[PDB]
Design a protein around this nucleic acid. Structure first.
Ligand SMILES: Nc1nc2c(ncn2[C@H]2C[C@H](O)[C@@H](COP(=O)(O)OP(=O)(O)OP(=O)(O)O)O2)c(=O)[nH]1
Ligand SMILES: [Ca+2]
Ligand SMILES: [Ca+2]
Ligand SMILES: [Ca+2]
Ligand SMILES: [Ca+2]
Ligand SMILES: [Ca+2]
Length: 901
DNA sequence: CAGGTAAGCAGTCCGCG
DNA sequence: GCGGACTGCTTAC
């Protein structure tokens, strides 16, 4: 097989590389890598190296990496550019793997671990590591085994061995319900004392050294705790055995308010699953406890136990250990679904970076572009200092707040990356500038043509047309990948709808799910067999289709995020290719494109309708338009349609056969106007929206910019079995909105859009009547809690104290003195409830850690003093009032003359 | 910690005769 | 109590 790296490090003048050799074996080597850097040289100097601008360079080969780094410093002292890849391990990887890396995941050791630490005096701080580690479960991907290290004797209690037999039993049998599919994969090791446990763990770690290391909060908790505990018991040299090169570094992670400590283990790639999830999931969660996320992702119930975790080991060691094992498995289950590790490996190897660098689009693109340029013997410029400067972004149209019955939307495929490719925007393709006219002059096509030679953006920039820039070239490659995976995602989605349809008429038989590839549209034969299947088989097929869709989603949306990150990186001062001229060329072209096409669509539709000056485009954001289709439907007449699907078909046909060709002609003219390199503005129909045929539903409404709701029947070619709400920006979409309130507001909107005013009034009246029975967690608001200290003045709110911080301070006084009570963690999320006047907490609200029950100490008092009236008005009535006034609708029945009978 | 700008709403402080 | 200046938080792109 072709070799591939696992990890790479620079340690002094050596590269330390772990890799898979040509036989599939893991190896480690130390290489005295001699780096090269570059300086500009005279035109007469014969060379094959040129900077990105075509200026000749001489290569300087250094005796060692320190020599190279010192040379960079001296070049700064002289005042001359030091060119080339200054991150020497990226240069090493580029030299050693001068080919597209094909990796074999089965050979990469992926470790998933979790530790338990009993502590009677509050949260066990990793930097202190003052309490024994009493459990470790460490899953190894190569062995496919859960290795369980269990401390039986501790200063906090001596316990009996964990029983695998009890662990397997149902909760109703007194067991722990450790999933049957992992029972045979557990390797259980009990220990008489902690020193022995840790020594054996380290020997095990040396035998089975993780390449990728993951788990839940491992970077912020498990890794520093294990490192510091071992350091405290045995000394530093022993703790450094966690690194295969015996090198570690305390790394300070700092933001705008305070800092924290993590341990860098050289020769290991740590991908904490919480961070993978936050980056790659495109969710924003009220809580990031593993319990909360597992419930959300997997629909598994929380692991229940009696009493605090600080007493769980002594009271019920059996469950304590079973829960440690299940916690490790839950991360594996989430990954089986989301495939973030696979994503990271894909992106890391593609870029030729340390895998953990996938968190940084700047580093990722720096490496992609360097490797691309190196292929041509071109030489990357030195990174420079730039002051942070604001720059303009997208255009967003101000909508007229209203109901909108029939709506068709369109938006550009990969807008910003497509603009980059179309205009040819790149550091080395800048050709000059032209004298700019006001933006509206380009939008209305009255401005002088910018250039008859170069490709232009209405910010004044001109670009070469003779050859593609490296940014367009490399962005196109990742775009093509994204497009492939999105194809699979949408096929899986359409396949899901077929199954949902079939589930209306399930067959009374015993059978199996069909063995099919859900990434491809079902054939006629498959469709026929599906129509003959049982509910059991259909539901299994739906589950599989939906898992396939999720896998496609992960692969596509994060490749989209990467390419969009390149457009953004051009406006990030830490990017090697930072240039506000290029960043603004993208954003300003986008503003033009949107407003240009708004004009063209209006002109086209006024033509086909025989009107003048009428606004068909009601809204737009960045690269999208929302077109009122009422007059189109009305031109045929509603009574001509057999059912909802009939007019959806008609609008779909109108969009594809009339709208899109007109849109395309408008954009081709714009491309010619700007003299662009290639027409790539592809604005395809997104949504077809409207009320169900014959209903009193309103179809959709807008309250303002970035705040709307649509009843969608077809989304990017997926024809839904049941209408789906596309809701953007409204409170139903915000993690800060109480769970039960999101649900109720969503139902109000569904009723507005699908059923009408009377239906809405019926639901509101019921909700208002019953909501006091809702569980306190379901009606609590959520907020991130930053700067708790700033606003804390002797335990009381300081000037300008935010509402949620006030709540936290109220909580702190209420639990004061308790070493055991859960503390609110700076920067994490809290639940927030308002409190009735004259409550014993002495303030108008209380807040506590999100994803948790409030401590039993005060729970009864919170429940008793909760202000339901305020809660209802702020989270429910006020947003609903916003929706209904916008839609010109009443959520309460107004008086009428009929009342007099 | 890690990636760009636009823009919405909650809430504080305080004016507004 | 609404509106502005401001902070804080959170979404749409
Ligand atoms: N830097 C950055 N830019 C974004 C992000 N989301 C959207 N944008 C910018 C770049 C996009 O091209 C543009 C339009 O947003 P869209 O959500 O419609 O994405 P895009 O057109 O790229 O892909 P699409 O084919 O519509 O799925 O807005 C983001 O998360 N980061
Ligand atoms: Ca635990
Ligand atoms: Ca788009
Ligand atoms: Ca599309
Ligand atoms: Ca059937
Ligand atoms: Ca869009």
């Amino acid at each position: 097989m072709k070799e591939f790296y696992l990890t790479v490090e620079q340690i002094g003048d050596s590269i330390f590389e772990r890799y898979i050799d040509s036989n599939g074996r893991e190896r480690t080597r130390e290489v005295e890598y001699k780096p090269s850097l570059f300086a500009h040289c005279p035109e007469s100097q014969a060379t094959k190296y040129f900077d990105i601008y075509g200026k000749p360079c001489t290569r300087k080969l250094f005796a060692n990496m320190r020599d190279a780094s010192q040379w960079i410093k001296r070049m700064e002292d002289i005042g001359l550019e030091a060119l080339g890849m200054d991150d020497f391990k990226l240069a090493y990887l580029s030299d050693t793997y001068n080919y597209e890396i094909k990796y074999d995941h089965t050979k990469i050791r992926v470790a998933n671990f979790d530790i338990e630490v009993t502590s009677p005096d509050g949260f066990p701080e990793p930097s202190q590591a003052k309490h024994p580690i009493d459990a470790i479960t460490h899953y190894d991907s190569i062995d496919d085994r859960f290795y369980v290290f269990d401390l039986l004797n501790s200063p906090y209690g001596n316990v009996e061995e964990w029983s695998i037999e009890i662990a397997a039993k149902l909760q109703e049998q007194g067991g722990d319900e450790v999933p049957s599919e992992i029972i045979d994969k557990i390797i259980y090791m009990p220990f008489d004392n902690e020193k022995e446990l840790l020594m054996e763990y380290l020997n095990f770690w040396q035998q089975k050294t993780p390449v990728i290391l993951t788990g839940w909060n491992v970077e912020s908790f498990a890794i520093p705790y294990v490192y510091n505990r071992i350091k405290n018991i045995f000394g530093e040299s022993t703790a450094k055995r966690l690194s295969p090169h015996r090198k570690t570094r305390v790394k300070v992670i700092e933001n705008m308010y305070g800092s924290r400590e993590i341990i860098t283990l050289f020769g290991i790639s740590v991908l904490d699953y919480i961070d993978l999830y936050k980056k790659f999931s495109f969710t924003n969660q009220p809580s990031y406890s593993l319990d909360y996320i597992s419930e959300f992702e997997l629909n598994v119930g929380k692991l229940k136990y009696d009493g605090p975790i600080s007493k769980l080991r002594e009271s019920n060691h059996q469950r304590y250990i079973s829960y440690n094992i299940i916690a490790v498995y839950r991360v594996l289950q989430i990954d089986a679904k989301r495939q973030f590790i696979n994503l990271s490996l894909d992106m890391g190897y593609y870029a030729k970076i340390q895998i953990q660098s996938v968190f940084s689009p700047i580093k990722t693109w720096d490496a992609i572009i360097f490797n691309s340029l190196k292929e041509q013997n071109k030489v990357i410029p030195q990174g420079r200092s730039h002051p942070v400067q604001p720059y303009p972004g997208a255009f967003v149209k101000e909508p007229i707040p209203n109901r909108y019955k029939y709506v068709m939307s369109f938006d550009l495929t990969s807008a910003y990356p497509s603009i980059i490719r179309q205009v040819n925007i790149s550091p080395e393709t800048i050709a000059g500038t032209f004298k700019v006219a006001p933006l509206h002059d380009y939008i209305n096509a009255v401005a002088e043509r910018p250039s008859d030679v170069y490709s232009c953006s209405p910010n004044g920039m001109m670009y070469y047309k003779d050859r593609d820039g490296v940014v367009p070239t490399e962005i196109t490659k990742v775009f093509n990948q994204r497009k492939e995976h999105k194809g699979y995602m949408l096929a899986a989605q359409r396949n899901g709808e077929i199954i949902k349809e079939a589930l209306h008429n399930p067959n009374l038989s015993v059978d199996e799910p069909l063995d099919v590839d859900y990434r491809f549209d079902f054939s006629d034969e498959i469709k026929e067999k599906i129509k003959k299947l049982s509910a059991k088989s259909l539901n299994e097929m739906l589950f599989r289709a939906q898992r396939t869709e999720v896998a496609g989603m992960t692969a596509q949306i994060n490749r989209k995020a990467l390419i969009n990150g390149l457009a953004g990186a051009l406006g990030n001062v830490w990017f090697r290719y930072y240039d506000l001229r290029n960043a603004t060329a993208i954003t300003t072209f986008g503003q033009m494109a949107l407003q240009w096409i708004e004009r063209k669509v209006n002109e086209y539709l006024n033509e086909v309708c025989g009107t003048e000056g009428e606004a068909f485009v009601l809204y737009g954001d960045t690269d999208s338009i929302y077109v009122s289709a009422d007059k189109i439907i009305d031109k045929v007449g509603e009574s001509k349609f057999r059912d909802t699907n009939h007019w959806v078909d008609f609008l779909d046909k109108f969009a594809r056969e009339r709208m899109e060709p007109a849109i395309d002609r408008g954009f081709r003219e714009m491309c010619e106007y700007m003299n662009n390199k290639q027409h790539l503005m592809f604005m395809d129909r997104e949504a077809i929206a409207g009320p169900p045929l014959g209903s009193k539903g309103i179809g959709g409404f807008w309250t303002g910019k970035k705040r709307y709701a649509l009843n969608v029947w077809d989304m990017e070619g997926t024809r839904y079995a049941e209408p789906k709400l596309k809701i953007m920006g409204l409170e139903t979409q915000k993690s800060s909105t109480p769970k039960a309130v999101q649900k109720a507001l969503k139902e109000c909107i569904r009723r507005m859009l699908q059923e009408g005013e009377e239906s809405l009034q019926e639901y509101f009246k019921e909700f208002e009547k019953e909501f006091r029975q809702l569980n306190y967690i379901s009606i609590a608001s959520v907020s991130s809690a930053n700067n708790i200290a700033k606003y804390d003045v002797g335990g009381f709110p300081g000037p300008k104290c935010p509402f949620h911080i006030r709540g936290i301070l109220t909580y702190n006084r209420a639990i004061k003195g308790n070493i055991d009570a859960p503390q609110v963690v700076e920067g994490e999320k809290v639940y927030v409830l308002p409190l009735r006047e004259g409550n014993p907490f002495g303030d108008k609200c209380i807040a506590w850690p999100s994803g948790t029950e409030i401590t039993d100490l005060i729970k009864d008092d919170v429940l008793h003093w909760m202000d339901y009236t305020v809660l209802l008005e702020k989270t429910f009535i006020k947003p609903l009032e916003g929706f209904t006034s916008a839609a010109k609708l009443d959520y309460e029945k107004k008086a009428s003359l009929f009342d007099m009978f």
